[PDB]
Amino acid sequence: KRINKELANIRSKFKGDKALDGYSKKKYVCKLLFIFLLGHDIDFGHMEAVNLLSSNRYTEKQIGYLFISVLVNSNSELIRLINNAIKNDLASRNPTFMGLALHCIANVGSREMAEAFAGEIPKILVAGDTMDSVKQSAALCLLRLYRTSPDLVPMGDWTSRVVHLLNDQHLGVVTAATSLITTLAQKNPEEFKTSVSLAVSRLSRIVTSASTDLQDYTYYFVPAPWLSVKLLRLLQCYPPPEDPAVRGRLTECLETILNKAQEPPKSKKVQHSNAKNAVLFEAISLIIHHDSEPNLLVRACNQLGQFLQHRETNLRYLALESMCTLASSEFSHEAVKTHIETVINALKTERDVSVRQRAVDLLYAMCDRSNAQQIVAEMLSYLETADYSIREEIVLKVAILAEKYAVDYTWYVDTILNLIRIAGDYVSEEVWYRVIQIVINRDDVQGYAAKTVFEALQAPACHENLVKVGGYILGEFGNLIAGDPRSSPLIQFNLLHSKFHLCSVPTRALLLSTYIKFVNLFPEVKATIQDVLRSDSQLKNADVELQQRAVEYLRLSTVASTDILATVLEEMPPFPERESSILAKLKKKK
Amino acid sequence: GLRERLLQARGRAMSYKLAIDMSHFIKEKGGLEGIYYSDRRHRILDIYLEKEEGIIPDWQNYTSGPGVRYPLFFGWLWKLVPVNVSDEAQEDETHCLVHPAQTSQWDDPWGEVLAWKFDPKLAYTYEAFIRYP
Amino acid sequence: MPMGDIWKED
Amino acid sequence: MIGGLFIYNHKGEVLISRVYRDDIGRNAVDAFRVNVIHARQQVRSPVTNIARTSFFHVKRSNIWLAAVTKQNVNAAMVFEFLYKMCDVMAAYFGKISEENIKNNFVLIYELLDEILDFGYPQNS
Amino acid sequence: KYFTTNKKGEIFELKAELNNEKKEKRKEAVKKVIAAMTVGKDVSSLFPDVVNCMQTDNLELKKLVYLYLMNYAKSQPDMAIMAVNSFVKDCEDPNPLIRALAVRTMGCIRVDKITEYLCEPLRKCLKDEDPYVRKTAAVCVAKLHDINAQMVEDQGFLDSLRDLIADSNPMVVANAVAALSEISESHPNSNLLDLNPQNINKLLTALNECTEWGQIFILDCLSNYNPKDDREAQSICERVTPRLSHANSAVVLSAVKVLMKFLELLPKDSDYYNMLLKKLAPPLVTLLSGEPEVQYVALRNINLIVQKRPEILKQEIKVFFVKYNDPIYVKLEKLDIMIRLASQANIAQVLAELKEYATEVDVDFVRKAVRAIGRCAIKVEQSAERCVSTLLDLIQTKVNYVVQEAIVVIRDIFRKYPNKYESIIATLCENLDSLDEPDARAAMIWIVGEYAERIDNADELLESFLEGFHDESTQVQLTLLTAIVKLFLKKPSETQELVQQVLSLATQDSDNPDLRDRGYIYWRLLSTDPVTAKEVVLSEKPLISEETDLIEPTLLDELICHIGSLASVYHKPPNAFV
Amino acid sequence: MIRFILIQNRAGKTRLAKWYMQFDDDEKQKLIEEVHAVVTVRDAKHTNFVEFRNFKIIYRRYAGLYFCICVDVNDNNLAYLEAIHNFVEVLNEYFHCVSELDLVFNFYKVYTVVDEMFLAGEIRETSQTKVLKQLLMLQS
Questions:
Q1: Is residue E323 classed exposed, middle or buried when 0-12, 13-18 and 19+ CB atoms within 10 A define those classes?
Q2: Cβ neighbours of residue A383 closer than 8 Å, sequence gap 6 or more
Q3: What are the structural domains, with CATH classification, of chain F?
Q4: Which of B29, B35, B90, B119 is best to mutate for the C interface (most C CBs within 10 A)?
Q5: Which residues contact residue A191 at a Cβ distance below 8 angstroms, ignoring those fewer than 6 apart?
Q6: Nearest CA in chain B to F48
Q7: Where would you find this protein in the cell (chain D) (predicted)?
Q8: Which of A369, B100, D1, E397 could in theory staple to B38 by disulfide, Cβ–Cβ 3.0 to 4.6 A?
Q9: Which of A137, A88, A141, A101 has the alpha carbon at shortest distance from A118?
Q10: Which residues contact A350 (CB under 8 A, 6 or more apart)?
């Protein structure tokens, strides 16, 4: 309707080669971009605007640059003319045109443009004749080209000039060079080792300044919060300095950061509060990642403990987020474990799902030997009323904690059975692999696990994973509960034969192995199970797994040699020591 | 003057009888009971009373409790009512972004938008002396 | 006699 | 039977909702918009099973009439009730648009208080 | 003066407007409150100002206040008991519409004082004058009985329900039997009180003189009934038989449910069985010409009807051919019902549309069609060679979502016929013209494992998969042993590094206990007696049934009684959605 | 690093979209709907950070507009939240006041402010006075 009328008006403006003007064509491209903002696709004559980039009108040139940035196609001659205009603007002395070309490179990300302009852009970045606004775009453009193609980035001799960028009076160049060096330090630490000692002095000159300096780079009476966060995140990607003077200067800077955090606020603005707490949280993350100063670690743990009692939910989120590696320490581990009841209360009294997820992650991280049963019970009470989207990670974390911290495995089998009963559809396969491996490996929870899963299978609303676990556990240890009148082999077969029909394909595959183990175990139960194996619903089934299982078990039950049958269907030897497949699944998931 | 400075915010002894008289002068001048609350309008009103009458910046101290905000110092006749903005108001294409309907909401510790409103019931007796110690 | 707050940009 | 009757616009904002049983809440309101409307193309079968919850939906080319149940309903009865509701609203105020929602917001709830009672589609 | 809201950039008080004498302004204010309640605000701080201030006109304002109360009945009883006495003092009002509205808005309150303070207005309006009051009374009886708790007069409520079953108004008795079915959702002592020789005739007269909605509940409770007489059963079938109601789908499928559960006679000698088979087919054919959602529900029920009794829509297949203006679910289900109804007299009509559907654009529909060609090959006897040639021509187009689904039905054809197609393997396994999904991988591995006399270079094609042993496929051992239990005996000192390599990979590398137990069962068998292993593994296998995509017979007997239910549409057990 | 910057009103449209990583057309069509369905449901009494799979999407609500900046979980969320507020204040001080109609009508200035504020997933200039001076110099 209206979009069709707008497309008809755009075609009437530019369909053929009618008599138009430069400002009329600029207004037509602006109207086409406004129609593209409403959700309409049109590509009528991109060359008429791509060839217009060599003009002198800055507004029309920027409109054409935005058009070729938002509608970057796979054209050959148009992209060649665009790269030629980019090289002409880079060779020109126009800083606005050079910055527009650098923004077009950093937003395009073409492989041919990255292979062509891989050498000129650091030469522009180290060019002292350029303005300060060009370097801050060029360093981020080189960062974008390095993130696009890291192999096509040389380690030239301009590195000493790159480290020397941080000594500038203008600080946007410092921000761009910090964002460059923080990415390049993961491959070249020795090429930017002196940048650590320069950035320490830069951070000291920032945080030891009053309100007189930094007349434009301040933010709500906070001196340079983004630059301080960038410098601390740069120092987090480096080891602590071996020089004692640099170490003491860094310690004094972090002490002044903590003292400014403990200071009362000047204004009442929440923007000032966020811009002051951001540097505090990045300094806390630096202190925790270093883990070198216990005097700093104790103060940071006390600061986060007092920060957890705050009223702002998006502050309590960060207070729970920045403590996972703090729980992994050794000296301040008791100071982390002082507020486990506060973490449990934050998990109970809830206002946000991601806040609850961060509380779950912090409880799982700090769970070493504090209260394993209490942590597992609180996790299960959270899981009983959790969401239906992130339940699998919580199930794997409960399984990891239960298989890790357990002195007697009876509580472990009860925990796995409660986890299977409460939302067993999200239980991954590694959990019910692991409980079978642990029950086979241990030799004092076998009869208890068999009786517990036999009582758990008698519920009408059983889940499929419970049928699998109970099937293999009964097929392995049906002999140890044969004396009880409530657990005869006839009932042991009849419960699984009731659960066999309306369940799924691997369940029906596993219960047939359980059936042939029952035929091997109890000669009283051989007749009915042999009739079930001889039935046509098992023989003529369309599934190859069930057909092969039923056919070869019917043939194996009637070879008239009980010695070979007992030699084949004997007791299973235990599993070898694996390497925590549940942990591998959790690492592949998260 | 005062109304223009308050609507441009889109991004001696402290005697109680003189404060009552100045609140009545503000209400008859058409400056309040229709606008919202922010720290900039707080500082503008304080600087305006200090410029036009030479008043010490001590009177404007409102309660920090959740809900209705009353003046703590005696004499000021302007309480604050927590205005819950309707869903059809925060959807207009001409509402200002940096405006205390969406800027002052993040700043209060309870997260409630505040506006101004006259209350002549507090002209009889105190409220902060019997509400909070 | 109060007035109305500027809610809309003209 | 019917444990909720949710009318959604073409974007996802609720216009008229109603809760009949205690097993349907704001999570049941939000999950339908999260995994039905705001999703990919190639719209599958109209009876969506999410978290042991059944969502029936009917899109009348501008609006989305949905029902959220949690047990063994009669299958075609819910869709026939939805089509009867759409026909009643059509005979009431012509077409179905947001202007028809806002101009007859009391009348829609008055029709829902008579044509449906505890999920039973009782005739007026 | 609390909860002050705005109006397009203004300031005005709601509570003064609610307590004001302007009733139109109070109606506009409560309309704004209900609008905020619908969009999701917390307007719970106005409850004693919208409930206790009921001093204005009755109808519209009381309806809006009762809507607010039935929306916020989950609030606290200390706030809900501010005017609850004047709320429950409404069973003596002169308007029965007001009485029924008050009962219907009092029934939704799950409060502790409900069973002690609502039994008197309920019993004061049971034997009332207007039938809508008794309708709402039985609705609220079922609502209070949804908790299934022993109330103060729950036995009297059940006795009043049994009295309301045999009453005058058809909608009233239909709602009463619906409430008996609702309390029959659990298993009480008085479960499904029939009282046959009067209640059956009363329900039949109500079904004859009922409206277009109560018939669904009447036939729903009639579906679970199982008599034993003959003339009574024939009278029941004669009263049930005229069903072409304006509610085009629900009443028709409920009557089909009643007629199919009402099938206890000779399956080949009863003439009325053939009469019912002639009776069901015009509704089961003319049910498809409606709206797409009830069309999809009808197709999902017709699939179960065909799977149980194939002699209903057997002679009519022309109504199941897919057109070009149908949605994807109807497009899939009409195809599945067509390939289930592909008989020995319509294969020329079936196969042309089957080979035409493969060139469509819906990916799941093309996958269903290329499985459908193989299913029709299994179904029809004298078409398997032509369908095998058609599947080979479709595979020769080298399409990724066609070959990986065609080789599975090719494996099904190979399992149905084990001798007549010993030439496709050396070409099809040599192609492997995709990166196959695990179903096609299992099909390829089973085809390589079986028929090993003609694929004698199978060691390379098995060891191509044996290195990357990370998938869900136990076929790589249960088909390796079934061929290299005879090839390793025919060639000694050969492929020991396969028949022990896959067992060493299934013994102490696979963490799955199912795969480990399969590996130990194989390893303890062939390493002890090769003749015993050849007798057990390489024994003859029976052929599969003709109808391929079937469900289990116990689940089919479960879905017979739930034809009108949602379990028929989901094709799952009814305990899969609680 | 900043993955995408979005301005989504509560009706459902998209006013400003800047994509710095490599997304497809169907990926750009799906991520906008996912951002809308996650962000436009949570109220003001919740947090401002949401996680998608590995995202840390930070959103604010200015008068029906929803400002979203995405990041990976490595960077300071309060720093990017105050970057959002600083960008909104720059767009406010470019005019005397700003709204959705002004952002629609002056999108050529909006893209100029975004390209002079953010670039390549990072921040170009933290200040606002130099950006206003650059915008006034480029106003001719």
A1: exposed
A2: A391, A394, A395, A398, A419, A422, A423
A3: 1-140 (3.30.450.60)
A4: B35
A5: A155, A159, A184
A6: B106
A7: Cell membrane; Membrane, Coated pit
A8: B100
A9: A141
A10: A356
Query: What six digits make up the tokens of E176?
Result: 């009463």
Structure tokens at F51: 């996680």
Is D122 among the domain residues? no
Helices (H), ranges, E92-130: 96-106, 114-117, 119-123
Range B2-131 has CATH code 3.30.62.10: yes
CA proximity to A521, closest of A478, A486, A480, A560: A478
B97 contacts chain A (CB < 8 A): no
CA distance E79 to E73: 10
- What dihedral angle (degrees, nearest 10) is formed by the CA atoms of E279, E281, E287, E289? -130
Exposed, middle or buried: residue B3 (CB in 10 Å: 0-12, 13-18, 19+)? Answer: middle
CB atoms within 10 A of CB F96: 11
A587, two tokens = 């690492």
Count of structural domains, chain D: 1
In whole angstroms, give the CA distance from residue A156 to residue E401.
50
Side-chain-side CA neighbours of residue E191 (13 Å): 8
**Sequence-ordered list of residues with C-beta below 8 angstroms from that of F54, at least 6 positions apart, any chain:** F72, F73
Helix H segments across A149-243?
A: 159-163, 172-184, 193-207, 225-236
Find, among A225, A162, A218, the residue nearest to A194 by Cα: A162
Answer yes or no: do C9 and B34 touch at CB < 8 A.
no
Range of the structural domain that residue D23 is part of: 4-113
Method of determination used here: cryo-EM
Distance (Å, whole) CA E232 – CA E199: 13
Are C8 and E10 a contacting pair at CB < 8 A? no
Please state whether beta strands B78-84 and E4-5 pair in parallel, antiparallel, or not at all (unpaired). parallel
Kindly state whether residue D83 falls inside one of the protein's structural domains.
Answer: yes
How far apart are alpha carbons A160 and A182 in whole angstroms?
A: 15
CA separation, residue D14 to residues D48, D64, D79 (Å): 19, 10, 20
Give the whole-angstrom CA distance, residue F99 versus residue E349. 64
Q: CB contact, 8 Å: E438 with chain A?
A: no
Among E1, E2, E8, whose Cβ lies nearest the Cβ of B89?
A: E8
Per DSSP, the three-state class of B116 is strand
CA-to-CA distance for D86 and F134, rounded, in angstroms? 57
Start-to-end CA distance of chain E, whole Å, equals 46
How far apart, in whole angstroms, are the C-alpha atoms of residue F96 and residue B25? 30
| Single-letter code of the amino acid located at B12 | R
What type of residue is A499? K
Query: For the CA atoms of E31, E37, E38, E39, what is the dihedral angle to 10 degrees?
Result: 110
Q: Could you count the other beta carbons within 10 Å of the beta carbon of residue E344?
A: 10
- Alpha-carbon separation of residue E531 from A519, A559, E449, E535, E538 (angstroms): 22, 11, 19, 6, 10
Domain-located, residue D118 = no
Question: In this structure, what CATH number is given to the domain that contains residue D9?
Answer: 3.30.450.60
User: What gap in Å lies between CA A244 and CA A250, rounded to an integer?
Assistant: 10
In this structure, is residue D119 part of a structural domain?
A: no
Please count the structural domains in chain A. Answer: 1
The domain locations on chain B are 2-131
Q: Which class for E458: exposed (0-12), middle (13-18), buried (19 or more C-beta within 10 A)? A: buried
- Measure the CA–CA gap between E438 and E431, rounded to whole angstroms: 17
Locate breaks in chain A with C to N over 2.5 A; list the residue preceding each: none
User: Domains in chain E, ordered, with CATH?
Assistant: 1-578 (1.25.10.10)
Distance from CA of E11 to the nearest CA of C (A): 9
Question: From residue E565, how far is each of A359, B77, E218, E570, F86 by CA, in Å?
Answer: 42, 67, 15, 9, 57
Chains C and F touch (3+ CB pairs under 8 A): yes
